[PDB]
Amino acid sequence: SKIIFRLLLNVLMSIIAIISYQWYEQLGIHLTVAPFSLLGIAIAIFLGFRNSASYSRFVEARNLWGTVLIAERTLVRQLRNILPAEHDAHRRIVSYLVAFSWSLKHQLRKTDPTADLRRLLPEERVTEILASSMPTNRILLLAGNEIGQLREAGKLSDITYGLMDNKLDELAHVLGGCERLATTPVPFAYTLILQRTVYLFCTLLPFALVGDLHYMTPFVSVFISYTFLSWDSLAEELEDAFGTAANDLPLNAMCNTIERNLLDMTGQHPLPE
Amino acid sequence: SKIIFRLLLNVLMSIIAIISYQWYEQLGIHLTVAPFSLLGIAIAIFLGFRNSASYSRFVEARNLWGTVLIAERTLVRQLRNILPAEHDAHRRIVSYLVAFSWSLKHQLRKTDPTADLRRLLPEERVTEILASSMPTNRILLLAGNEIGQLREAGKLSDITYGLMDNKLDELAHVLGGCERLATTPVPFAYTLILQRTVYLFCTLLPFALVGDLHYMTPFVSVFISYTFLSWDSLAEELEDAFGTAANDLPLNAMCNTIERNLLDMTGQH
Amino acid sequence: KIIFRLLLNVLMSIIAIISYQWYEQLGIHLTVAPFSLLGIAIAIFLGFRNSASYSRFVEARNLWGTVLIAERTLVRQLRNILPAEHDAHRRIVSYLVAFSWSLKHQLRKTDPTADLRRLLPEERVTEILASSMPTNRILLLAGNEIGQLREAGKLSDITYGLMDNKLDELAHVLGGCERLATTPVPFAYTLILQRTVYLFCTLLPFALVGDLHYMTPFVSVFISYTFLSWDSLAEELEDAFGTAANDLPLNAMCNTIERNLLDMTGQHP
Amino acid sequence: SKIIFRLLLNVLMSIIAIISYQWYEQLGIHLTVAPFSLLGIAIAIFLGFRNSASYSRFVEARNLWGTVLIAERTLVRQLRNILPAEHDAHRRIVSYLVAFSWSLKHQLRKTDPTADLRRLLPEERVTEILASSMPTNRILLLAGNEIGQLREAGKLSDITYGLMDNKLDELAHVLGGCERLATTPVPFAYTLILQRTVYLFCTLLPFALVGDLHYMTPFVSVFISYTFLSWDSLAEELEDAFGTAANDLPLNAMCNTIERNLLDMTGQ
Amino acid sequence: SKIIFRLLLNVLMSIIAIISYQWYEQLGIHLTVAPFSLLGIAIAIFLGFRNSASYSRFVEARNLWGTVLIAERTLVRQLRNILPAEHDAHRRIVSYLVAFSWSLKHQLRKTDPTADLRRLLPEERVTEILASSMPTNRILLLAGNEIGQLREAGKLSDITYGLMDNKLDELAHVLGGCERLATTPVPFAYTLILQRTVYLFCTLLPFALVGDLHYMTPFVSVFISYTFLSWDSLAEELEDAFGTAANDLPLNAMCNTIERNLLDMTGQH
Ligand SMILES: [Cl-]
Ligand SMILES: [Cl-]
Ligand SMILES: [Cl-]
Ligand SMILES: [Cl-]
Ligand SMILES: [Cl-]
Ligand SMILES: [Cl-]
Ligand SMILES: [Cl-]
Ligand SMILES: [Cl-]
Ligand SMILES: [Cl-]
Ligand SMILES: [Cl-]
Ligand SMILES: [Zn+2]
Ligand SMILES: [Zn+2]
Ligand SMILES: [Zn+2]
Ligand SMILES: [Zn+2]
Ligand SMILES: [Zn+2]
Ligand SMILES: [Zn+2]
Ligand SMILES: [Zn+2]
Ligand SMILES: [Zn+2]
Ligand SMILES: [Zn+2]
Ligand SMILES: [Zn+2]
Ligand SMILES: [Zn+2]
Ligand SMILES: [Zn+2]
Ligand SMILES: [Zn+2]
Ligand SMILES: [Zn+2]
């Protein structure tokens, strides 16, 4: 945590305010609580509204990765109920849906997806995915091909295809939502204005409190600084949700759960009497 | 009250603040209202936003369990309307749908679902559901198999199947919603950090209010503490509705309400 | 209703005026600054409470709005697809009107027998009252009317599906309305704030008397009026469907629904 | 602009507080800023939440009238794409949909739609619509008749009818939405509490401020009054959210845009 | 940023406050921190609510532009799945959809769209687009005609047409949503009330702050003037997300992303 260094600096800023208190009126400088109370309340309001915006983006990030689990379950679930005999079709579609989860993971984590794609799909398909400028959207097209080919075979009617097509439409809203959160953040000015005001408020606070507290200055100033800094750092963990930090989503575990889910519903060996 | 231990501790610290006030001039330590007022208003704003997020989680929690009630009612309604003669199918689907509700209750609470599943389903399926790592999802698959088998027999058309399949999707959106809302740790320790900030503000407050109130310190300081601690403990309850430390009554009720409703529709009681 | 405490607030202020000459005699200090910090905190918590209460009232009004929308569109679809089947029209409308009235009685926790016998044959009223939830039975009986027209050959599976969607939407309303009635916003919400504001407003003139002297009862009743009126509005918005001053006129709403559905069929009330 | 008359009243109430300040010690009355700070902050919190609720109902009114534009554009678009030859059908439905837009406007504004209805529709239909107690709903039923009769002619299938029916369902949600906003206003308590409080706070404010500010009282008190009254008046206009005021929705401009769009798509 | 000018002018106003403080009791002028504190907190609350509503407009504008990508991705995807042989049909529809994004961008910015329309579509169609009052809605009708004529031949059934029809309905919701934000912004009172109040508070702030701070008056007044004006400017920027400012949407880059998505490898699959 980088918060603890700021707390140690707040103690140092408090002690230098205590010893230099003699040279205050000799220069003619005064700092009271009431002007800093107005500034602090203003900052406490603005931080609250920013953290609300940061939480709302984190909820949206959590919701979209929840939908990957829902849409892929229901698509395999529909496949098992409508076409219970097409087991060769199942394992092809399943492998694409697992691959979609892993490729979406690596797209948000800015990492190479080649290892996971080769683990799940044949080399003719991995080359096709990597050729595309948008690799994860290619997978949905290739998964869409498999549902389309079953409709082309006559195994799926236009109604049963339409029921399965809507699940792929849900999956497209996941990818488009995840890309939108990754590319467009909370406008940088939000974090730039507040982080500047908080740090400058926390350092100038013991100088404003030294006249009222005298010797209790380091104990109180830290306790006020801690409240304003913890709330500021809370938003700095929620805004970026697709990284590898403490509050950031465990996407490795989530993709493992999806892989476990889709190989739980399938994998049941057909025709053992 | 649960927090009444900390309320009497606040009065205990107030009496300490009165007697030790004589020693304050020996080190040159002073505590005015204005520094603790700025901190107090700041905490009050931060508790307001946190409680709003806690309420937001609670409303969505009840909405999902409302959809369990809605989707299962409308699935049984569609079965009676489209296929009025197929009572053998009715009994099986209702058995699975109620088994979905109870298994979801035991999944959110992390409790054993074996006793409830054995009551509603035969042992061939109970072992199959318990073998799966996702038991509630397995029930939806088996419920989907019942709708799917009526389609393959020729009794359900592709459109009438589609109407019933959408109701199974609603329950699957709930399961995925409930799984997400229970297994998310939205803070690292900030649910405890903000709780600790309230605690230490409450205990240091009588030392700050002793100069302005003297003997009225235990009266006013406990009344400020009460308003802050009650609002903090309220957000603690609303954040985890599907908790082991949370009330079991609203979750056990809606599982019985759905069982009572589905048995009434088919005409069994 | 709030005037009973507004007169009590002036009476408590009179006590604060006469006892001010005994303040330093008893040895008590009460400054404005600690009560300012507490009062701002309460104002924040009431601000979030009233906002949460407003969202309940909006959702409750929206659900009853959807009854009027869904039933209009169901009759509209019946007239466009099957213009000849007026025997179907009159039966379904009488069910949809009965659903609205039984929804009113369910939320109010009252007997619906007086309104059900007015609209429906006696055998159906006995069947409706037999069920655990009367409204869910009506939607099932209205669904059977659409279902029997599908079995006759007059409605295809597609045209059944369009009419079925509105019956699904009405069941989402029923599940929504039941949720807002059966699950109130947790116990503590009113237990904290209502009693906190009462104890704040009565103990405030004791703190105000040091700075205001004889203007104490005039300014204390000002702050009390603003705090209590915001408190009372939030309780009127939370609850709900009943017979309070600021609540939904459900008797007038059900009459508007009945008049709309009779007007579309070519009938006069 | 009710504010400018009230701002001059506040300066006039401030000068009373200055001249009667010599009488304060005689009556035994002392007024500090600190209790009025507590009250004013509370008012500012409650005004902030009310204005938030008022803006939310304005956005909802904007979104519903946005849906009028979208659902009617798409229904005409669906008609041209499925049935490119049936122009006799187009002329009636477009005129019905435009009549829906104007009838919804006149129902919300509480004005007579007779002049607009006879401008678009034949006398056999206008007299039938005006006969109905819900004239905007009557248009949706007659618009549904045109889609329904195209289905019964064998020109529209059950599938293509269902795609068009969803748009009529979407416009019916708007009608029920707009009626909900009109018949049920923002609880009159919100206006009864705050407006009484804001006016009484601003009037009583210089009497507490005169003890600390003296001759700067009419400058400071009028600037606090301006902030509190401007925010209250803004929330008042957003609460409606319709009507004839300048701050409200330009519904005449919107209905003409809908009328122009549907006549553009048909080539008229 | 125009704040840097108003920040430097705020320091100059603070120098006037320092030199004139001696003459305060001579001129008969008293200015304390407490009334300006009450005013400043009130402004900070109203700025907090405005900035939140401003951000909500920015989010909804981004969400609609996100939908442009998603709805067009799937519309081409469905064409690449249902009709994989119709390659000449693909390139015609794709070109309309790329033209839809660019024509939307130029409509919201109020600039000439002819330069980008010629780049993507034939001259017989570009003139038909420019002839219409709403050029972006005309493109949806022209792209819809391509889907409609494939149904006319019998290549698409009524069901598979409906799947593609829903996607063009989704794009029309973006068109109406983006117009709603652009044609009418926030009420003009919102901007004119706050921008008058914020700076007139900031200029009159050092005159009230001089009594407590003396020589530190320009340091603290520029701090508060920074925090209040930076929040007002951010709110003013985000309200018009379709403008050409720093915190606004990069709509030029977004349309290039849509173009590269729909033309994945010159329209191949
Ligand atoms: Cl398989
Ligand atoms: Cl049965
Ligand atoms: Cl509807
Ligand atoms: Cl009829
Ligand atoms: Cl639409
Ligand atoms: Cl025409
Ligand atoms: Cl035409
Ligand atoms: Cl889509
Ligand atoms: Cl191509
Ligand atoms: Cl000086
Ligand atoms: Zn299989
Ligand atoms: Zn979509
Ligand atoms: Zn049965
Ligand atoms: Zn789904
Ligand atoms: Zn004493
Ligand atoms: Zn509807
Ligand atoms: Zn009839
Ligand atoms: Zn449903
Ligand atoms: Zn035409
Ligand atoms: Zn003709
Ligand atoms: Zn007339
Ligand atoms: Zn192609
Ligand atoms: Zn639509
Ligand atoms: Zn000086």
Automatic annotation (TrEMBL), chain C:
Zn(2+) 13 binds at residues 263, 268. Zn(2+) 10 binds at residues 169, 172. InterPro entries: YneE/VCCN1/2-like (IPR044669). Zn(2+) 4 binds at residue 29. GO terms for molecular function: chloride channel activity; metal ion binding. Zn(2+) 3 binds at residues 24, 213. It is found in: Cell membrane. It comes from the Bacteria. It is a multi-pass membrane protein. Zn(2+) 11 binds at residue 213. Zn(2+) 12 binds at residues 239, 247. Zn(2+) 8 binds at residue 111. Zn(2+) 5 binds at residues 79, 89. Keywords: Cell membrane, Ion transport, Membrane, Metal-binding, Transmembrane, Transmembrane helix, Transport, Zinc. PANTHER family: UPF0187 PROTEIN YNEE, VOLTAGE-DEPENDENT ANION CHANNEL-FORMING PROTEIN YNEE. This is Bestrophin family ion channel. It comes from Klebsiella pneumoniae.
From TrEMBL, chain D:
It is a multi-pass membrane protein. The keyword Disulfide bond does not apply. Zn(2+) 1 binds at residue 25. Zn(2+) 9 binds at residues 169-170, 173. Zn(2+) 6 binds at residues 87, 90. Zn(2+) 13 binds at residue 264. Zn(2+) 10 binds at residues 170, 173. GO terms for molecular function: chloride channel activity; metal ion binding. InterPro entries: YneE/VCCN1/2-like. Zn(2+) 11 binds at residue 214. Keywords: Cell membrane, Ion transport, Membrane, Metal-binding, Transmembrane, Transmembrane helix, Transport, Zinc. Zn(2+) 2 binds at residues 25, 30. Zn(2+) 3 binds at residues 25, 214. It is found in: Cell membrane. Zn(2+) 12 binds at residues 240, 248. The chain crosses the membrane at residues 1-21, 27-49. Zn(2+) 4 binds at residue 30. Zn(2+) 7 binds at residue 88. Zn(2+) 8 binds at residue 112. Zn(2+) 5 binds at residues 80, 90. Belongs to the anion channel-forming bestrophin (TC 1.A.46) family. This is Bestrophin family ion channel.
